[PDB]
């Protein structure tokens, strides 16, 4: 299928004392594979998947130097942004950055991205063309002009279309046993009386990977959203994901309702119905 | 910006009384990142609780998973207690094995 | 692998 490599960085200023808290995480698809936390003892980029531990000491040294350099860029950014927005030196502020690349089923480049936020709002982002910048406000417009004069988008485009894709393909190969394995959802339906006249039917999808999934209810073959509840997809804690969808129904009418499950790991979507003797 | 956390409290595996499992509290959709999350057993804070590395969604809101080993029983009550700048008082969400 | 960007705000 399609694949992606993404890096996420958050720095939070600490006005009372010291440097910002900095946390970096790298993912291949929905699998975390590296991390850096400025509060941790190692002060190194650390592995979080078995297939990345295959990499040699030059890799780990290089990733640690680069991730610490990202932390210092965020530290300078926080100071600059405080000045741009004429803010007090007393408050805590946040910078977030995400970048990465997507590839298709053939592992060729599809799309690249590089985006920044300040205090949880868009600040500046590279456009889909990997040439231009989207500045959300006039402070970001100043950054945009500076970056247009310093050839920044060219270097980012070269990384996103080149290096990013090349390392993604290397990791997909090295970690094939898990990264190229699809875990189809393990599905079941539960029934919970809500009164002596009605009951909730809950359609579960467990232990699946990747996270992308669709759960829909139908009544007599047509989509149903009234009296339904769909929870956000959530991590199981072992690398897989979970989700459920529920519908409130008149008791005795359970057979009209079907839950439909769509996922990359299923050749054909699944259909579930309540088994009345369950 | 200020965004209130969404909270889901659940087990890693379908729960069976007397069988070891993992209790999760997934907090998501919040901003800023500072948050207090405790897992409780009979209203008391569980000591050995671990958490994921801070990450975020397309809209920049944060998410974290807090987790610990636990053994569900007929008598014990489990919960997640969350405090954030957006909450007037800490929010307690009880664990229900059906959700 | 990480980039070495010059994205100084």
Q: Decide if B98 and A23 are in contact by the 8 Å CB cutoff.
A: no
User: Exposed/middle/buried for A37, CB within 10 Å: 0-12, 13-18, 19+?
Assistant: middle
Interface probe for B, chosen from A8, A97, A237 (most Cβ of B below 10 Å), is A237
End-to-end CA distance of chain B: 30
Alpha carbon distance A44, A65 (integer Å): 8
**Number of neighbouring beta carbons within 10 Å of residue A158:** 13
Q: Which residue has the tokens 């897989």?
A: A240
Quick one: which H or E segment has residue A73?
A: helix A57-84
Contacts of B6 in chain A (CB under 8 A): 232
Alpha carbon distance A110, A104 (integer Å): 6
Indicate the resolution in Å: 1.6
Contacts of A147 in chain C (CB under 8 A): 7
Which of B14, B22, B53 is facing A35, going by the closest CB pair?
A: B53
Alpha carbon distance A122, A139 (integer Å): 12
The nearest alpha carbon in chain B to A206 belongs to B13
**Number of neighbouring beta carbons within 10 Å of residue C6:** 12
Q: State the DSSP string of B21-90.
A: EEEEEEEEEEBSS--EEEEEETTEE-S--EEPPPEE-TTS-EEEEEEEEE---SS--EEEEEE-TT-SS-
Experimental method: X-ray
Alpha carbon distance A26, A15 (integer Å): 27
Cα A234–A236–A241 angle (5° rounding)?
55
Phi, psi of A76 (to 5 degrees): -60, -45
**B10 contacts chain A (CB < 8 A):** yes
Which of A35, A232, A242 is facing B28, going by the closest CB pair?
A: A232
Contacts of B3 in chain A (CB under 8 A): 120
Q: Are A186 and A122 in contact (CB under 8 A)?
A: no
Alpha carbon distance A177, A166 (integer Å): 19
Q: State the DSSP string of A138-178.
A: HHHHHHHHHHHHTTHHHHHHHIIIIIHHHHHHHHHHHTHHH
Q: Looking at CA atoms only, how far is residue A268 from chain B in angstroms?
A: 25
Alpha carbon distance B3, A166 (integer Å): 37
Q: What is the 3-state secondary structure (H, E, C) of chain C?
A: CCCCCCCCC
Classify B86 as helix, strand or coil: coil
Classify A63 as helix, strand or coil: helix
Please name which of B84, B90, B46, B43 lies closest in space to residue B66, comparing C-alpha atoms.
Answer: B46
Q: Looking at CA atoms only, how far is residue B14 from chain A in angstroms?
A: 9
Interface probe for B, chosen from A188, A230, A236 (most Cβ of B below 10 Å), is A236
Whether omega before B37 lies within 30 degrees of 0, making that bond cis, reads: no
Which of A99, A124, A167 is facing C1, going by the closest CB pair?
A: A167
Q: Which residue has the tokens 């485009």?
A: A157
Q: Are A101 and A109 in contact (CB under 8 A)?
A: yes
């Amino acid at each position: 299928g399609s694949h992606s490599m993404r890096y996420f960085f958050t720095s939070v200023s600490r006005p009372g004392r010291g440097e910002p808290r900095f946390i970096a995480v790298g993912y291949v698809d929905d699998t975390q594979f590296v991390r850096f936390d400025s509060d941790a003892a190692s002060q190194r980029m650390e592995p979080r998947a078995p297939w990345i531990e295959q990499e040699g000491p030059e890799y780990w040294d290089g990733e640690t130097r680069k991730v610490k350099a990202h932390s210092q860029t965020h530290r300078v950014d926080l100071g600059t942004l405080r000045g741009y927005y004429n803010q007090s030196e007393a408050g805590s502020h946040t910078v977030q950055r995400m970048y990465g690349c997507d590839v298709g089923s053939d592992w060729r480049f599809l799309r690249g991205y590089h985006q920044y936020a300040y205090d949880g709002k868009d600040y500046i982002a590279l456009k889909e063309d990997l040439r231009s910048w989207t500045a959300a406000d006039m402070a970001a417009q100043t950054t945009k002009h500076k970056w247009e004069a310093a050839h920044v988008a060219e270097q980012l485009r070269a990384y996103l279309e080149g290096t990013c894709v090349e390392w993604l393909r290397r990791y997909l190969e090295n970690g094939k046993e898990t990264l190229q394995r699809t875990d189809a959802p393990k599905t079941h339906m539960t029934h919970h009386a809500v009164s002596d006249h009605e009951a909730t039917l809950r359609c579960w999808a467990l232990s699946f990977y990747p996270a992308e999934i669709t759960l829909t209810w139908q009544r007599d073959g047509e989509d149903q959203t009234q009296d339904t509840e769909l929870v956000e997809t959530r991590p199981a804690g072992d690398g897989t994901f979970q989700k459920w969808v529920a519908v409130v129904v008149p008791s005795g009418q359970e057979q009209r309702y079907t839950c439909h499950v769509q996922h990359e790991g299923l050749p054909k979507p699944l259909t579930l119905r309540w088994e009345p003797s369950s | 910006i200020q965004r209130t956390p969404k909270i889901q409290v659940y087990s890693r595996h379908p729960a069976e009384n007397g069988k070891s499992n993992f209790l999760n509290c997934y907090v998501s959709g919040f901003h800023p990142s500072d948050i207090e999350v405790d897992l409780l057993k009979n209203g008391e804070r569980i000591e050995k609780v671990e958490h994921s590395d801070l990450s975020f969604s397309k809209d920049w809101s944060f998410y974290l998973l807090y987790y610990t080993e636990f053994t569900p029983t007929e008598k014990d009550e489990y919960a997640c207690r969350v405090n954030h700048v957006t909450l007037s008082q800490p929010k307690i969400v009880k664990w229900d094995r059906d959700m | 692998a990480l980039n070495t960007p010059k994205d100084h705000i």
